[PDB]
């Protein structure tokens with residue numbers, strides 16, 4: 001089966017531009033990232049501050065922002081949860097959805113920053129919205145029926161031992177909410193010819209979920225055959241960036257190889273699951289293996305690898321540009 005949207009290769013000019021960074025771009029990203037490098041456990045003041053910062057940053061860019069708030073039972077009692085959904089053009093039928101979670105694990109051993117999990121992904125999504133703002137606002141005027149949507153899930157982490165009932169609180173809630181929210185092509189702006197739209201979940205054209213990013217030398221694989229055409233664009237973009245000499249490497253004459261051209265046999269539970277169960281196509285941008293710092297007190301700021309983060313930001317910027325033809 002072909003991808004429902006013909007995927008036009010990024011022109012060289014655009015690839016080079018998406019692959020550059022000024023030191024002020026680096027500084028802008030780091031400034032954004034500092035806002036997330038704090039404990040943000042569900043129910044806490046800093047958690048509320050982080051949500052407020054996400055919401056304000058995106059409202060300031062003239063995105064439509066929904067705070068999807070609810071209370072849910074947990075092994076620790078009733079807890080408040082608030083997903084944040086930012087949509088560049090609400091009326092556009094189809095959404096390229098980029099996602100991550102913004103809560104941090106309540107770690108039994110002490111204060112836990114969750115720098116890779118997922119403070120960096122949070123910052124990457126905001127940095128994309130900020131750095132591509134002009135181009136995105138231009139794209140929004142086309143009436144082409146496609147837009148960008150950013151979802152910051154709350155309550156990804158378990159309070160106790162990960163289970164179907166203790167984990168993915170925000171994503172389980174949102175997927176069900178959108179599945180039950182009925183709509184059709186006539187109510188929406190420029191749906192593709194062959195689109196079957198019965199509810200809001202059908203408008204998610206593909207969900208690209210970023211998680212556990214920020215450690216050196218991540219290895220990604222295509223986890224879903226369904227989105228192999230999309231995944232292959234990340235492979236190609238990374239290859240073109242290396243060919244252009246636009247990746248930061250430790251030594252001359254090396255290449256990044258983050259996006260492997262293989263598939264793996266690996267089952268990961270994450271925020272994508274409740275959407276996958278409802279036929280949303282998923283690209284899961286998560287390393288295999290997980291970073292060594294995963295769910296340890298060492299998942300902190302100093303253990304981030306900034307050259308890797310810069311390289312990923314170039315891939316992601318080029319990918320959004322290519323998908324939306326910015």
Ligand SMILES: [Zn+2]
Pocket residue numbers: 105117157295
């Ligand atoms: Zn985690």
